[PDB]
């Protein structure tokens, strides 16, 4: 195969085994000062997401044009407040919220974003960025706009002295460092079958299916409660120690832990286990991301929870995740999603998760290293 754009980039070749660890090319000593040229009629615009009007414009772009399933039945519906959470973590930069507008109408038609992240990859910690929310309006697809967005964000990141990035995609590109699979745990099977997210199993009736997926009304783990301000330091401690066992992980400051885990209704939930001694020994977390159900007369949205980071030191992981499912059901979610990364394969089948269609590929930009199994991936992106 051939990749017109990706073959020009500092990434390894598909199907070539890597034995070394390091950058594909050295750091650049001079960087292009001018933005890359867009097709006539379009212009760059940095989006100030602290402006209500601009945030809503981005919401609308993504709501109408972002990731869909293969059958064009579901589309991610990131809320404006979720977008602020995902795009303004500690160290965020305005120039890294990179929009494309039509010059005449001002209509937002493209976006790409970078946020800073310290990333541990095997035996090296690098300052990187995480690239997310790459989106081109449906009416502009297949016109090679994506490569311009990627090159422009690369340039803007280079200006800040950063030369590596991490990103995920549902498509195969040169060259995945890890390959994960989505799994889904039905919470509201009647709705999920009705909207054709799932189907009735061959030998199962609806009644049997509702029975199969039924959950306790309240969590069972002793001392489980929502994370509070006082828990920030211990959650940071727990996470840092837990992540050591994997080969691709974030390295979060205490300020970053506060940002990513402190509960915000309809965005991020974190529950800690505070034991009989008053010690926090475990935590679970999941984020809120609904999908629009396209072309349906009565069901308009699928409420999905996504497993984030789950740390166990005294509570079995199986128990923690059982409680995450119950909590998600209580909060009105239709489905609970998780990847087969970290120690997740240890609970997925047992807790009645079903395997999904889509893969999620993990990539590094300008870093060559051996690929890893899903269980060694310890990084979750929004
Ligand atoms: C040091 C700092 C570095 C910073 C940069 C790090 C790298 C960041 C990399 C980006 C990480 C993004 C992380 C996320 O946000 S992944 C989420 C991507 N977004 C969506 O799926 C939303 C709905 N889809 C769209 O908007 C798409 O049609 C997009 C915008 C993706 C492509 O628009 P379009 O359909 O109109 O195509 P084109 O004619 O303009 O361009 C075709 C070229 O684009 C390559 N392509 C297609 N999809 C992806 C993809 N998901 N990652 C990387 N490359 C992709 C494709 O192979 C081809 O290259 P090649 O085969 O000829 O070589
Ligand atoms: C319910 C639903 N709604 N939507 C929109 C879909 C596709 C489903 N079905 S799904 O659960 O089984 C699922 C899900 Cl959630 C997500 C992806 C996927 C694909 C490509 N890219 C990403 N990224 C997300 C993280 N950052 C950028 C890359 C995700 C694929 C599948 Cl197939």
For this entry, give a set of tags:
16 strands, glycylpeptide N-tetradecanoyltransferase activity, three-stranded antiparallel β-sheet, globular, about 20% helix, binds the ligand Cc1nn(C)c(C)c1NS(=O)(=O)c1c(Cl)cc(-c2ccnc(N3CCNCC3)c2)cc1Cl, Aminopeptidase, binds tetradecanoyl-COA, alpha+beta, 13-stranded mixed β-sheet, about 375 residues
Number of domains: 1
Helical fraction equals 10-25%
CATH architecture, by name, is 3-Layer(aba) Sandwich
Major β-sheet profile? 13 strands, mixed
Question: Could you say which structural class the secondary elements and strand pairing correspond to?
Answer: alpha+beta
Bound molecules: tetradecanoyl-COA, the ligand Cc1nn(C)c(C)c1NS(=O)(=O)c1c(Cl)cc(-c2ccnc(N3CCNCC3)c2)cc1Cl
For this structure, what is the CATH class? Answer: Alpha Beta
- The CATH topology annotation reads as Aminopeptidase
Amount of beta strand: 25-35%
Please trace the helix and strand order, writing H or E for each element.
EHEHEEEHEEHHEHEHEEEEEHEE
Number of helices: 8
Gyration radius (Cα, Å) is 21 Å
The shape is: globular
Straight-line distance between termini: 30 Å
- The overall strand count is 16
Main location: cytoplasm
Family: Belongs to the NMT family.
EC number: 2.3.1.97, 2.3.1.-
Catalytic activity: N-terminal glycyl-[protein] + tetradecanoyl-CoA = N-tetradecanoylglycyl-[protein] + CoA + H(+); N-terminal glycyl-L-lysyl-[protein] + tetradecanoyl-CoA = N-terminal glycyl-(N(6)-tetradecanoyl)-L-lysyl-[protein] + CoA + H(+)
């Amino acid at each position: 195969r051939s990749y017109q754009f990706w073959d020009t980039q500092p990434v390894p070749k598909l199907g070539e085994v890597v034995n070394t660890h390091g950058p594909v090319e050295p750091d650049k000593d001079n960087i292009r000062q001018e933005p890359y040229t867009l097709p006539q009629g379009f212009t760059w615009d940095a989006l100030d997401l602290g402006d209500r009007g601009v945030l809503k414009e981005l919401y609308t772009l993504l709501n109408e044009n972002y990731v869909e399933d293969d059958d064009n039945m579901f589309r991610f519906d990131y809320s404006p407040e979720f977008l602020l959470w995902a795009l303004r973590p500690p160290g965020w930069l305005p120039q890294w919220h990179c929009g494309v507008r039509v010059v005449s109408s001002r209509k937002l038609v493209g976006f790409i974003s970078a946020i800073p992240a310290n990333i541990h990859i095997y035996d090296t910690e690098k300052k990187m960025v995480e690239i997310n929310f790459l989106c081109v309006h449906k009416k502009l697809r297949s016109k090679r706009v994506a490569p311009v967005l990627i090159r422009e964000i690369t340039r803007r990141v280079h200006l800040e002295g950063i030369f590596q990035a991490v990103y995920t995609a549902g498509v195969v590109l040169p060259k995945p460092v890890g390959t994960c699979r989505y799994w889904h745990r039905s919470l509201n099977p009647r709705k999920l079958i009705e909207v054709k997210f799932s189907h009735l199993s061959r030998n199962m009736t609806m009644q049997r299916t509702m029975k199969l997926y039924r959950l306790p009304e309240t969590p069972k783990t002793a001392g489980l409660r929502p994370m509070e301000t006082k828990d920030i330091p211990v959650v940071h401690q727990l996470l840092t120690r837990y992540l050591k066992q994997f080969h691709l992980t974030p390295v979060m400051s205490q300020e970053e832990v506060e940002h990513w885990f402190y509960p915000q209704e309809n965005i991020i939930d974190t529950f800690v286990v505070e034991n009989a001694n008053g010690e926090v020994t475990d935590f679970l977390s999941f984020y809120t991301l609904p999908s629009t159900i396209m072309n349906h007369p009565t069901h308009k949205s699928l409420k999905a929870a996504y497993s984030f980071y789950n740390v166990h030191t005294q509570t079995p992981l199986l128990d923690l995740m059982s409680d995450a499912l119950v909590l998600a059901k209580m909060k009105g979610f239709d489905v609970f999603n998780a990847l087969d990364l970290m120690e997740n394969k240890t609970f997925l089948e047992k807790l009645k998760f079903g395997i999904g269609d889509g893969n999620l590929q993990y990539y590094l930009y300008n870093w060559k290293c051996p690929s890893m199994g899903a269980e060694k991936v310890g990084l979750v992106l929004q």
